[PDB]
Each structure stands twice: as structure tokens, then as C-alpha cells.
Design a protein around this ligand. Structure first.
Ligand code: P38
Length: 337
């Protein structure tokens, strides 16, 4: 074991190892609440997330297991890394809390854009890094599904990492058209839509699609990408869905070069390949990496795929104690980086 020390912040108690000092709150709410601290073993600043009631319910227990397993598997430069996981419990029986530690970052992608107008070369490097981490993650059948500026961290020198549940020191704005209108049977390209949305907002200083709800959001999207064609229509399972879309005033796809004028024509071409209604036609992360747009950063030799990731557990229905024990084993088996 190591040595812990109690203390309360905001209204939540923090039982952490002595190696972490200067716990300053960052943000709470969700299933987490996180603090910024100093890692004495490394001399570096870290982010420590104390999960809220980790094993209170079955959804909590399994979502706690899911995240731990995920973070444990992720070994890539553009994906948030797990520096350490700990608990102030000495046995499984007393196991009630879970703290996860990562590198502290410079800022949310939301701050960067919200501040000034980045250069084109900045857009290329940032979007290139997202896609690099995306290829890694997708190569393991992992779908982020919640890509947005706040889930994107960049340090002082514009180096980027993908995280999740980013707590700022509408997710529907970056939501693919399909995963809203339901349709179900969503896939990884759902992430490429988000990237296309993030990129557009980096080139222009505003939200591509600021929809107020699922209805507005879809309206904003279609004005751009148009209304579903006969080919897309043929692939829509839901009777209510195609009844819905087919009932709208039909819209044409817009000329992106007209929509994103002044933008690098190579960026527009990438935008065009990402912002496709039909998920089957969107470009993939890997194929996007070879796009002329990233000629300056692209290296097919430094664009790794992930070791295979087994998410069989996702299908399991277990008890809070079974998920908690599974999670305890994962904590115990943790080997630092
Ligand atoms: C710019 C400021 N902000 C940060 O530096 C900063 C802010 N937050 N807020 C939320 N969580 C953070 N980090 C984190 C995140 C996970 N979990 C994940 O990111 C996960 C959980 C589940 N799935 C995924 N992935 C990510 C990769 O793609 C697939 C899904 C990924 C666990 C533990 C931790 C400490 C975090 C950091 C590092 C900041 C800097 C200085 C002072 C104040 C703010």
C-alpha cells in the first residue's frame, strides 16, 4: 500500500495518496467531479477524478468497470492516458471508492477556438491529431460517440488528446444525424461526423449546427447536407423515420466551397467527405489521414492501431458486487506507465 490523507472540497471528501498535493477543484457533477493536483513522484501536474457513488447501482457499477477497462487499454499519444488508479480500501470488502488520474492539460478545445481565430495550419494539426487517435480507438471497435471541443485537450504546444466526460474548468450539436433520429445500429463513422463538425467550427468561429432540439438539429443539418436521396432512403429501416424525413420539404445538398469560402479548398474537400448524411459513405479516420489536407503531418508509419479490445462484458447483466469485484481486480492489476 501507500499512505492516504483525508480532506474535503466543494462538499465531497478526498481520500488520496500523499504523492498528490495541492488538490484544487476543477469541476463536479456527472458521475465524477475532478481536481487538479501535483504529482510528487513525477514533478508533473495531474488530473484526479473521484467517481461519485461508483457502485451505487448496476449502471454505476458497470459504467465504473467500463471506464476503468477502457482507460487501462488506451496506450496512444492522442488519447487520454491512465497514469494511476487507486482506492483508500485495503480489501475488496471495504472497496467503495475509485479515483482515476491522468495528465493535467492546458485547455479544452472549446477555449482555444473561443479565444481567437486559429490558422489553417492549426486546424490541420488539431484535426490530424483527433483522427490519429480516432484510428487507434476505432481499430479496437471503440466508438467515442461524444466528441466535442470539451472532450479534446491540447497542451501549451498544441498537442492534442481525446478524453471523455470533459469537465470545463450541447453535445447534440456534434451528434451525427443518424444517432438522434435513432435508426439504431450506429457505428464508428458517427465519430467522423463529430470531427467534421469540430473542424468546421475551427475554420469558422461558430457552431456548424446549433440545434435547440432533435428536430431543430436535424433541420440545421439537412439545410447543409440536404435531404436523404433514394440511395439513403433504401437503407432506412424505420417506418416512422423515413415517413418523417420524406415528409419534410426536400432540400438540396449545398456547395461546401460556397458555404466555407476563404477556407483552404483542401479543408473543404475534407469537410465534404466527413459531413455526409449516409454513414456508409463518410470517410474513415484512417482514410482521412491520407487526405492531401494533412500532407504536412501525415506519416503512415506513425499512425498505430490498438491491440484488440474485448468488450464482451458489455453484453453481461451482473450484480453490483460482481461488477465491483471485477473493478477491484482491475485496480489491483494496474501497472503504471
Ligand atoms: C484544460 C483543463 N482540463 C484538464 O486537464 C482535464 C479536465 N478534465 N475533466 C474531466 N476529466 C479529465 N480527465 C480524466 C478523464 C478520465 N476519463 C476519460 O477521459 C475517459 C473515460 C472513458 N472513455 C474515454 N475515451 C477517450 C478516448 O476515446 C474513447 C473514449 C475517456 C478519467 C480520469 C481523468 C482524471 C480532465 C483533464 C485531464 C484544465 C487544466 C488545468 C486546470 C483545470 C482544467
Amino acid at each position: 500500500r501507500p499512505t492516504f490523507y483525508r480532506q474535503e472540497l466543494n462538499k465531497t471528501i478526498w481520500e488520496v495518496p500523499e504523492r498528490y498535493q495541492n488538490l484544487s477543484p476543477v469541476g463536479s457533477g456527472a458521475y465524477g467531479s475532478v481536481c487538479a493536483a501535483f504529482d510528487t513522484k513525477t514533478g508533473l501536474r495531474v488530473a484526479v477524478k473521484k467517481l461519485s457513488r461508483p457502485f451505487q447501482s448496476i449502471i454505476h457499477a458497470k459504467r465504473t468497470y467500463r471506464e476503468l477497462r477502457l482507460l487501462k487499454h488506451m496506450k496512444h499519444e492522442n488519447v487520454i492516458g491512465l497514469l494511476d488508479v487507486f482506492t483508500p480500501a485495503r480489501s475488496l470488502e471495504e472497496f467503495n471508492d475509485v479515483y482515476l488520474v491522468t495528465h493535467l492539460m492546458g485547455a479544452d478545445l472549446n477555449n482555444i477556438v473561443k479565444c481567437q481565430k486559429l490558422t489553417d495550419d492549426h486546424v490541420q494539426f488539431l484535426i490530424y491529431q483527433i483522427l490519429r487517435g480516432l484510428k487507434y480507438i476505432h481499430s479496437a471497435d471503440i466508438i467515442h460517440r461524444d466528441l466535442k471541443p470539451s472532450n479534446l485537450a491540447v497542451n501549451e504546444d498544441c498537442e492534442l488528446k481525446i478524453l471523455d466526460f470533459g469537465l470545463a474548468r450541447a453535445t447534440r450539436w456534434y451528434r451525427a444525424p443518424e444517432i438522434m433520429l435513432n435508426w439504431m445500429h450506429y457505428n464508428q463513422t458517427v465519430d467522423i461526423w463529430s470531427v467534421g463538425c469540430i473542424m468546421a467550427e475551427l475554420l469558422t468561429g461558430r457552431t456548424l449546427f446549433p440545434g435547440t432540439d432533435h428536430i431543430d438539429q436535424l433541420k440545421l443539418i439537412l439545410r447543409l447536407v440536404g435531404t436523404p436521396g433514394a440511395e439513403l432512403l433504401k437503407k432506412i429501416s424505420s417506418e416512422s423515420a423515413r415517413n418523417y424525413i420524406q415528409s419534410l420539404t426536400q432540400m438540396p445538398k449545398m456547395n461546401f466551397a460556397n458555404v466555407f469560402i476563404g477556407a483552404n479548398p483542401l479543408a473543404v474537400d475534407l469537410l465534404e467527405k466527413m459531413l455526409v448524411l449516409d454513414s456508409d459513405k463518410r470517410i474513415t479516420a484512417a482514410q482521412a489521414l491520407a487526405h492531401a489536407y494533412f500532407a504536412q503531418y501525415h506519416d503512415p508509419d506513425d499512425e498505430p492501431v490498438a491491440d484488440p479490445y474485448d468488450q464482451s462484458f458489455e453484453s453481461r447483466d451482473l450484480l453490483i458486487d460482481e461488477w465491483k469485484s471485477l473493478t477491484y481486480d482491475e485496480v489491483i492489476s494496474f501497472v503504471p506507465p
